[PDB]
Amino acid sequence: SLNVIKMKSSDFLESAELDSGGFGKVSLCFHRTQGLMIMKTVYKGPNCIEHNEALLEEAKMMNRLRHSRVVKLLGVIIEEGKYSLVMEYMEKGNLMHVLKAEMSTPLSVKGRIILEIIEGMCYLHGKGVIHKDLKPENILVDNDFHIKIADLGLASFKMWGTLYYMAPEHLNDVNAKPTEKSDVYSFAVVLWAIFANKEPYENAICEQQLIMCIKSGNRPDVDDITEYCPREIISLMKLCWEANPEARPTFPGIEEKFRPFYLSQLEESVEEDVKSLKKEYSNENA
Ligand SMILES: CC(C)(C)c1cc(NC(=O)Nc2ccc(-c3cccc4c(N)nccc34)cc2)no1
Ligand SMILES: [Mg+2]
C-alpha cells in the first residue's frame, strides 16, 4: 500500500536542513515542477541498516494513519534500497513558531487549533496509538492555519520524551508505560503554551528541582498567561494535568466538553480572523 514515488536526485534540491528530532536527516526541498516538500532521509554510516529499517516502519505507520490531522506522507523514494520519506510541507512551521511571531494569533483561531489537536488525538487513540511526545514542536501548521500532528522522534524511540510535557508518573519511573492519559497530560501543557505563547517553567533553576516540583503538584503558571483565556479552557487545562491519571479525561471526553464550547462561542469569527492573519502576514513580512 506504500506509494513509491519515481523521483531522482536531479528532480529537486535541498533548500535547508531542519532539526530532525533524532537520527533522520530532515530537509526542506524544492522540486523542479512540484515546489516545496519535506524529505526525511538516512545519513551514510555504520548505522544505515537500522535507520533505514526504522524509516520504512515510519513510512508504514504514517501511511496506515493517513488522516486530515496527521502529517501527510506523500510517498517513498527507493534508490538502491535506501528510503527517503517525502511529506507535504506545512508552510507555517511548528505551533510554537507560530505563537512566538509578532502577529498575535486570535482567540478563535487558537480555539480551532485546539479543536484540531483533539480531533488528531481521538483518531490516534482510537487507532490504539499512544503518541508519547505531544508538544508544540510536534504540531505543524499550514498557510490556512490548520494543524497536523507529527511525531518527529517516534521513529527514533521505537528503534530503541520532553521534560515540560511529560506526565509526572513518567518522571517517577523510567519503566512506566505511556498511556492515553499520559498524552492527555501533555495536552494540558500544550493548552497552556497556546495561551502563554511560550514554554512553561522559565523560572526553574535546575532539572532536578523541576522534576521534584512537578511530581509534588506544580504546574505551569496560569497567572503568567497575559491574554484572555476562557474559563472553559482554563478549567480543561487544569483537568487534563490532574496528578492522578484516572482523574484525567479521555480525548473523546475532551471533545465532548470542548466542541460545543467552540461551536457556540468561537467558530463564528474564525474565517474572518484567518482572513486578517493572512493579510497581516503577507503585508507585515512580504
Ligand atoms: C502517525 C504518527 C503521528 C504517530 C507518526 C508520525 C510519524 N512521523 C513523523 O511525524 N515524521 C515527520 C513529520 C514531520 C517532519 C517535518 C519536520 C520539520 C518541518 C516540517 C514541515 N514544515 N512540514 C511537514 C513536515 C515537517 C519530519 C518528519 N511517525 O508516526
Ligand atoms: Mg538534487
Any idea where the domains of the chain sit in the sequence? 1-286
3-state class (DSSP) for residue 56: helix
Nearest Cα to Cα of residue 139 among 105, 172, 98:
98
Check if 239 has its Cβ closer than 6 Å to any atom of ligand 1.
no
Closest ligand (CA of 20):
1
8 A C-beta contact, residue 94 and residue 101: no
What are the strands, taking DSSP E only, across the chain? 12-18, 25-31, 35-41, 73-79, 82-87, 93-94, 139-141, 147-149
Q: How far is CA 191 from CA 124, 145, 195, in A?
A: 18, 17, 7
The grid coordinates listed for 16 are 535547508
Check if 240 has its Cβ closer than 6 Å to any atom of ligand 1.
no
Return the number of other C-beta atoms located less than 10 Å from residue 124's C-beta. Answer: 22
8 A C-beta contact, residue 83 and residue 39: no
Q: 228: Cβ–Cβ under 8 A, 6 or more apart, which residues?
A: 107
3-state class (DSSP) for residue 48: helix
Distance CA 208, CA 225 (A): 25
Experimental method: X-ray
3-state class (DSSP) for residue 100: coil
Distance CA 70, CA 59 (A): 13
Check if 18 has its Cβ closer than 6 Å to any atom of ligand 1.
yes
Q: Which atom of ligand 1 is nearest to the CA of 91?
A: 22
Nearest Cα to Cα of residue 262 among 140, 115, 157:
115
Check if 133 has its Cβ closer than 6 Å to any atom of ligand 1.
no
Distance CA 48, CA 57 (A): 14
Distance CA 281, CA 145 (A): 12
Distance CA 171, CA 193 (A): 20
Does 21 show up as a binding residue in the annotation? Answer: yes
Distance CA 123, CA 267 (A): 21
Environment class of residue 218 by beta-carbon count within 10 Å: exposed (0-12), middle (13-18) or buried (19+)?
Answer: middle
Place of cell 522522534: 153
- Supply the residue whose CA is at minimum distance from atom 13 of ligand 1: 150
- DSSP H helical segments within 15-172, as ranges? 48-64, 95-99, 107-126, 154-159, 169-172
Distance CA 2, CA 171 (A): 37
What Å resolution does this PDB entry report? Answer: 2.6
| Residues making up the chain, counted from first to last | 286
The grid coordinates listed for 56 are 520504512
Q: How far is the CA of 265 from the centre of ligand 1 (A)?
A: 32
Query: Is 1-286 a domain of CATH 1.10.510.10?
Result: yes
Environment class of residue 171 by beta-carbon count within 10 Å: exposed (0-12), middle (13-18) or buried (19+)?
Answer: middle
Distance CA 132, CA 89 (A): 23
- Supply the residue whose CA is at minimum distance from atom 24 of ligand 1: 89
Is 11 annotated as catalytic?
no
> What is residue 164's DSSP assignment?
G
- Find the helix packing angle between 251-261 and 107-126, rounded to 10°: 150
